[PDB]
Design an enzyme around this catalytic site. Structure first.
Site, mmCIF file in Angstrom:
data_model
loop_
_atom_site.group_PDB
_atom_site.id
_atom_site.type_symbol
_atom_site.label_atom_id
_atom_site.label_comp_id
_atom_site.label_asym_id
_atom_site.label_seq_id
_atom_site.Cartn_x
_atom_site.Cartn_y
_atom_site.Cartn_z
ATOM 1 N N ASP A 171 6.020 -9.856 4.256
ATOM 2 C CA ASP A 171 6.075 -8.408 4.081
ATOM 3 C C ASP A 171 6.728 -8.165 2.717
ATOM 4 O O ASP A 171 7.569 -8.955 2.276
ATOM 5 C CB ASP A 171 6.915 -7.766 5.192
ATOM 6 C CG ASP A 171 6.145 -7.608 6.500
ATOM 7 O OD1 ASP A 171 6.788 -7.331 7.534
ATOM 8 O OD2 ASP A 171 4.903 -7.743 6.497
ATOM 9 N N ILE B 292 0.814 -1.207 0.000
ATOM 10 C CA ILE B 292 0.000 0.000 0.000
ATOM 11 C C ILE B 292 0.851 1.263 0.000
ATOM 12 O O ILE B 292 1.934 1.302 0.584
ATOM 13 C CB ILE B 292 -0.957 0.022 1.221
ATOM 14 C CG1 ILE B 292 -2.121 -0.947 0.992
ATOM 15 C CG2 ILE B 292 -1.496 1.429 1.446
ATOM 16 C CD1 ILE B 292 -1.720 -2.400 0.876
ATOM 17 N N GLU C 102 1.312 -8.857 15.096
ATOM 18 C CA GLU C 102 2.378 -9.742 15.555
ATOM 19 C C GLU C 102 2.133 -10.223 16.985
ATOM 20 O O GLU C 102 2.447 -11.365 17.333
ATOM 21 C CB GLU C 102 3.720 -9.015 15.460
ATOM 22 C CG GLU C 102 4.916 -9.805 15.955
ATOM 23 C CD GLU C 102 6.227 -9.129 15.601
ATOM 24 O OE1 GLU C 102 6.692 -9.291 14.451
ATOM 25 O OE2 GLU C 102 6.785 -8.420 16.466
ATOM 26 N N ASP D 220 17.880 -9.281 8.972
ATOM 27 C CA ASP D 220 18.179 -7.883 8.687
ATOM 28 C C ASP D 220 19.682 -7.789 8.892
ATOM 29 O O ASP D 220 20.155 -7.630 10.020
ATOM 30 C CB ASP D 220 17.460 -6.957 9.670
ATOM 31 C CG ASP D 220 17.585 -5.494 9.283
ATOM 32 O OD1 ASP D 220 18.662 -5.101 8.796
ATOM 33 O OD2 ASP D 220 16.614 -4.736 9.473
ATOM 34 N N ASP E 206 8.527 -5.246 1.736
ATOM 35 C CA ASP E 206 9.794 -4.513 1.760
ATOM 36 C C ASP E 206 10.919 -5.461 2.170
ATOM 37 O O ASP E 206 11.617 -5.263 3.173
ATOM 38 C CB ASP E 206 9.690 -3.307 2.704
ATOM 39 C CG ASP E 206 9.320 -3.695 4.121
ATOM 40 O OD1 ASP E 206 8.497 -4.616 4.303
ATOM 41 O OD2 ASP E 206 9.843 -3.058 5.057
ATOM 42 N N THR F 105 8.931 -9.360 23.499
ATOM 43 C CA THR F 105 8.029 -8.218 23.517
ATOM 44 C C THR F 105 6.567 -8.590 23.276
ATOM 45 O O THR F 105 5.882 -7.969 22.464
ATOM 46 C CB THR F 105 8.467 -7.145 22.494
ATOM 47 O OG1 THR F 105 8.595 -7.732 21.195
ATOM 48 C CG2 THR F 105 9.802 -6.545 22.904
ATOM 49 N N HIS G 141 11.773 -14.521 15.094
ATOM 50 C CA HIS G 141 12.158 -13.123 14.921
ATOM 51 C C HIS G 141 13.676 -13.062 15.100
ATOM 52 O O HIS G 141 14.210 -13.550 16.098
ATOM 53 C CB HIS G 141 11.437 -12.269 15.969
ATOM 54 C CG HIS G 141 11.668 -10.799 15.823
ATOM 55 N ND1 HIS G 141 10.635 -9.888 15.745
ATOM 56 C CD2 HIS G 141 12.810 -10.076 15.771
ATOM 57 C CE1 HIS G 141 11.134 -8.668 15.654
ATOM 58 N NE2 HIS G 141 12.452 -8.755 15.670
HETATM 59 MN MN LIG Z 1 8.965 -5.496 7.147
#
Ligand SMILES: [Mn+2]
Ligand SMILES: [Cl-]
Ligand SMILES: [Hg+2]
Ligand SMILES: [Hg+2]
Ligand SMILES: [Hg+2]
Ligand SMILES: [Hg+2]
Ligand SMILES: [Hg+2]
Length: 263
Positions: free
Chosen positions: A129, A62, A221, A244, A131, A163, A151
């Protein structure tokens, strides 16, 4: 049913030699944790091809996120379920902005402007996702009734540090003495039936929280984690599946970086 596998020549598994001595490769409920070295992709490819497996890959793009579609799709063509039937489902508010990406045979893409449908079109649904970019193999080794992904920022953390939503007023609430892993909301999947059950459960839980005037700390999440705590996944993907590198580098424990965040 399932037909017999053909004769295959590969290294004999070694009963007295641990797969990996540095990581946990099976959960307490006997679900495998997918790390490089744990699977023979040739055997798995045979098993799933003999069933003419079709995998649906869903992404939501989006506004400004439509700019990530080109790299996402181009890399998926090189690393995602190559050899198998794939159906991409791109949900976007800018259908005309979707890039024209060249797809290999047996792979198609549908643009949905912003369910039945999935049940009759694909066998498994993989929700990620946009990105992101694929950098290495992501194949049938992840397919199972229901899977979650560790994660990358909490795989080595104690449940206390997770978290999770900690307020009892929220449907996503998880006490400090509960929890197996911290799963990422950006990469989960399984059979169409199981994925729809999960999204249906979370949608209802989120509506209850909204009516109660509360919003989970990490939104979807947080609810995903509550769901997978109460409905154990049949496979858990290692952080190799969503990393990442800019934020976490490349630890020795990761033999491959398969799907990563785009800088
Ligand atoms: Mn992401
Ligand atoms: Cl999705
Ligand atoms: Hg192994
Ligand atoms: Hg999905
Ligand atoms: Hg949920
Ligand atoms: Hg939801
Ligand atoms: Hg969810």
């Amino acid at each position: 049913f399932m037909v017999s596998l053909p004769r295959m020549v590969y290294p004999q598994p070694k009963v007295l030699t641990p797969c990996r001595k540095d990581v946990l490769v099976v959960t307490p409920w006997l679900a495998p944790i997918v790390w490089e070295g744990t699977f023979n992709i040739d055997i798995l490819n045979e098993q799933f091809r003999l069933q003419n497996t079709t995998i649906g890959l869903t992404v939501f793009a989006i506004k400004k996120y439509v700019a990530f579609l080109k790299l996402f799709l181009e890399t998926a063509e090189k690393h995602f379920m190559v050899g198998h039937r794939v159906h991409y489902y791109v949900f976007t508010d800018q259908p005309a902005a979707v890039p024209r990406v060249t797809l290999g045979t047996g792979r198609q893409l549908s643009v949905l402007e912003v369910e039945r449908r999935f049940l009759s079109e694909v066998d498994y649904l993989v929700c990620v996702d946009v990105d992101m970019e694929f950098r290495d193999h992501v194949g049938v080794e992840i397919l199972t009734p229901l899977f979650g992904t560790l994660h990358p920022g909490f795989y080595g953390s104690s449940r206390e540090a997770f978290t999770y939503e900690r307020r009892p007023q929220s449907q996503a609430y998880i006490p400090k003495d509960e929890g197996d892993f911290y799963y990422l909301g950006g990469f989960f999947g399984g059979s169409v039936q199981e994925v729809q059950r999960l999204t249906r459960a979370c949608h209802q839980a989120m509506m209850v929280d909204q009516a109660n005037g509360i919003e989970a700390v990490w939104h979807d999440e947080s609810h995903l984690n509550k769901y997978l705590l109460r409905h154990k996944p049949t496979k858990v993907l290692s952080p190799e599946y969503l990393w990442d590198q800019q934020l976490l580098g490349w630890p020795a424990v990761l033999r491959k970086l398969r799907f990563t965040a785009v800088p």
